[PDB]
Amino acid sequence: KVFGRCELAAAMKRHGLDNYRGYSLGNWVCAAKFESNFNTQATNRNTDGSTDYGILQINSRWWCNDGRTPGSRNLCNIPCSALLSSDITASVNCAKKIVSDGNGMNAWVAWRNRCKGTDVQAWIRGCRL
């Protein structure tokens, strides 16, 4: 599913991501925009052989099982394919574990390079929330 900007903001908010670990909603929407262009089916293969999955491009090296990343962990305890669902619940739950782990949203390269330090509230401007 390719979400609209406000549609995704409202889904994220209902799932408890607004101000989660201090990160306002615009941060999450910005990260999703640049990681996946709001497409829950996005996949990208990394050089080490791991793959990134879903709207927030969660990586198989640590967070989900895809059966082809030898030596990896599955800290969210899910198949990576669950992260490609049109229902973003699995992706949100796993992201909450990721952002709690100490590095905050710096775990998302696109957030660090394209969202951090910018006016992220712009990503939710105009939305009914």
Which residues are part of the catalytic machinery?
A: 35, 52
Q: Is 57 in the site for Na ion (CB under 5 A)?
A: no
Shortest gap between Cβ of 28 and Cl ion (angstroms)?
Answer: 9
Q: Is 81 in the site for Na ion (CB under 5 A)?
A: no
Applying CB under 5 A, among 74, 81, 85, 93 the residue interacting with Na ion is: 74
101 annotated to bind ligand: yes
Shortest gap between Cβ of 92 and Cl ion (angstroms)?
Answer: 16
Structure tokens at 87: 């229902």
Query: Rounded distance, CA 10 to CA 4, Å?
Result: 10
- 5-14 and 25-36 helices cross at what angle (nearest 10)? 130
